[model samples]
Target: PIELPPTYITPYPEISAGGNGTYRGQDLSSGQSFPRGMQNPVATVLLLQGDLYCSPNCLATFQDQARRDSFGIQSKVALKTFAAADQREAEGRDLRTAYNEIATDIGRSQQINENIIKYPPGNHVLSGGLMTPFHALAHGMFGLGAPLTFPIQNVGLNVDIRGIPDVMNVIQSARPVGTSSLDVNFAYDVGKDSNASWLTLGNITLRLVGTIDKNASGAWTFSGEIRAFNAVYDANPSNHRGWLGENLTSLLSAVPFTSYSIEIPGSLPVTVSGNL
Candidate 1:
């Protein structure tokens, strides 16, 4: 059996949950490095409504920049000829622009969840999406401390390398065949602490792919590829805040965090040492 690299086993398990089970994942060490994106959106977007804040100061600076750039349409010549009254219009525009920014926040939030699964190179990963206090702010707006529950199966750290044929052949034959490596499986469910209404996560896999290097010294070092982490859920939540107001399963699925079939990009690197 291939053992878990030291880098992986050190920070065994850290667990907790927040508003509607915010994040409450198994591995906080590497997982901590990434934030899926803006965690919540409703409150921010609601405040941004043009029909809402007609006269606003919190959004003036943004308007100024747009007034200057004109969405890259206006250059130095045009900006210089601009009117002072236009400045006021820009200010209002900026405020709403800032509000609308929550849209990007929503999408990026979804991206970050996927990033964690793909980038982190480890066998034992609590590869799942996350939420923040902001995520439940809509429901939380209804009331504070809206305690959340995430039902998930227990999981842990492991490399258990003997399973991969590429790695196994290298140990058995001391050579490489078309770049051999192995990955780990993910097991998940709702948080064990939850007794109330719960959510189910299925087909969530934290796939850790890496290369097993054969060196001149022949001592054997494990060059693991940072494979992506992908997940599927029984209840997929929405990124929008109004989701709670508009949909019931949305509230039930108001999971806010969703990570799915992900693979690591080629650029980022991982460091772990050992041989099968």
Candidate 2:
């Protein structure tokens, strides 16, 4: 008979939203790391938030097409950049490191060269001025000015863990080895543009929950369920909208389901298992 590891849980720690807000599952003052095989300072879900700044002016997008034709289409392309763990730049990498470490611990493997500071089981929050690239796109008469890139302020991220993945418990049960299910709820917040000055080409808010499981062949898998999704073409006079802009705004805003999707596209959700 195989004995299973007991379910683990703990009280949440009192943490302040100070400094750059990049949390790596360690004590800032003492540099103490959390112990493995348990959720240190545990919470069924944890919450941590950090700030995001641009690399010396987080400018990433600028597209301006000067055309004499009454109707012309200008295509804009640019990429956003941010430094690792810098107050004046993006700090999501830190969050990634934390998540990797924690997942590695759960997977029961030692990752080489990578300090595994597993992201604790909790709501990881990232709130800051999202320096989005500003692209100036104009159509014919409405088009003016050259391409200028700048980070638009305001954005948010939160990895809320609603429940432990079923796969974890399955690992606890199967000593002979077998597939298990994944169960968890993840949510995020894409801050809104309240300052009507700059027109937002895209705006979308999303809420999704998903599960992770291993197949009979011993391969892991994941699936997601989107509960809420919305998008809007944010525009206003401050951003210097043209006649077409006004019409588009009116048209898009009137539609019930209006929103935009910005995909950074990175690694997949992590999980692991081994002899218990």
Candidate 3:
């Protein structure tokens, strides 16, 4: 064995020296290289996590226009803050809260290339800031800024996540707790801005299921997802269309869903195991 105690504090030992090295994993090693793109680390899996949130600067809106002003209406969902994770205020937080914090990081990304971290059997929760509702509208509205985060706590590997979506067991678990799957159903609170205020937008739901496991460091990783990820939109009863045209009965099915992404259209949820 080589005793580098006199010459090295354990810096770059190189795989040849048996000192240390990683496969295409987190070798990116640092916030700087992370933005270098994950393709290099794309094969890397040192430590992992995923998440989301809405920012105060984020503007969500619901609009339904007939064409040439035959009907033009819309509304915006008020975000609590647009501050970054480091700049966010904390105390009593929720989805809206966590969202606002993550929002500040929006438009600013160092994606290691279309990355998806596979998660293993474990408990996860998504929490954030406040989403304040505004007035009414007869059309579809969208709120700005939203972050999707995988809740995990290193409890000898006892991580748990809960909230809007039963993330705790979304990836198929084994412990004596939480469900082995996830199903999220929610609608925007368009507030009473007008008697004509009607949610023309469809109902949104998220579902997930997969295989779980622990990493060398004891953190959990989930894999074995087919259509394990899903996003569904139930048709509105008001004969309305949110983003999907009028002829569609439903928007999505029990298939793949991508919540993690960038600004062009947003990133994809990179599952950990094979994500590398």
Candidate 4:
């Protein structure tokens, strides 16, 4: 069984819809005919405009892309360039790019909902899409108050773990084969408090493709492999601490912190001890 964080859950369950055959020429075009009502206008453009709706997962995936693009996470050349650039300027650019993109997307979704048009009394089309709030993201490292830990015990089967047979074998057979190595993936986002102004550490994932097997001597041994952490930094520390007011001493440091711990509730008592 897999237990996801509360935020990971979506408010909307249904995501897709479609229908057939109906168009109003009056609304589609003016009261005019092309080529003086010629026989079958060549290349009749049937432009069907529909709404663009997305699930919580879709938003998270896009947000993650924003993070990567904002900070040049994958490009070595861009990383080196960012390193050479001024810290404050770089951080500001990255934060603005990521945050602004999401903000615009949310606004578009809202506008789409508002722009829902009903012409023929039973048909409609959204201009942009349905609104999924920024906070509803499945994997966002925003202003969450405390550190969150999602149970990811059996998610290995769903998560794409290609190019590694040993890992594949462990995760697949560990269930039916008994007492083999296991793989676990945990999605994490950490910050100081739930305040809107709180600095963000990042939103990222932790993968523990470790082997937990029993040796010939009957001792269970756990060896770890494919350990990696990928995160996108949102905002750096800032002096604006809002009305709640923190201690003066700590205010100078501008410290924001949170973490996620991976735990397995299996018979073998396997636990991945780490935090991000």
Would you list the C-alpha lDDT of every candidate in the order shown? 0.29, 0.27, 0.24, 0.26
Per-residue lDDT of model 4, residues 228-269, tens digit only: 242332222232223212332123233342232222221213
**Per-residue CA lDDT of candidate 1, range 1-276, in tens?**
122235543111222321121111233444233354444332233234333332333124323433444422212111111211121122222323432332222222322221111111122222122111111222222112223222122121233444444544444454563454545443322233221111323233334456556655454555564332333322233433232233333333423432332222221234454543
Q: What are the runs in model 2 whose C-alpha is more than 4 Å off?
A: 1-130, 133-156, 163-187, 191-232, 236-264, 267-276
Best-matching candidate per TM-score = 1
For every model shown, what is its TM-score relative to the native structure?
A: 0.26, 0.22, 0.20, 0.21
| Model 1 weakest 10-residue run by lDDT | 76-85
Each candidate's root-mean-square deviation in Å? Answer: 21.6, 22.6, 20.6, 18.1
- Which regions in candidate 1 have their CA more than 4 angstroms from the true location? 1-203, 214-218, 236-268
Candidate 2 lDDT over 15-80, as tens digits, reads 333322232232333423444554432221111211112232222111111112111111110110
Which one wins by lDDT: 1 or 2?
A: 1
TM-score: which is higher, 1 or 2?
Answer: 1
Cα deviation of 217, candidate 2, in Å: 24
Full ranking by lDDT: 1, 2, 4, 3
Candidate 1, position 19, lDDT: 18
Which window of 10 residues has the lowest lDDT sum in candidate 3? Answer: 150-159
**Best-performing candidate as measured by lDDT:** 1
Q: Name the better of 1 and 4 by lDDT.
A: 1
Task: Order the candidate numbers by TM-score, best to worst.
Answer: 1, 2, 4, 3
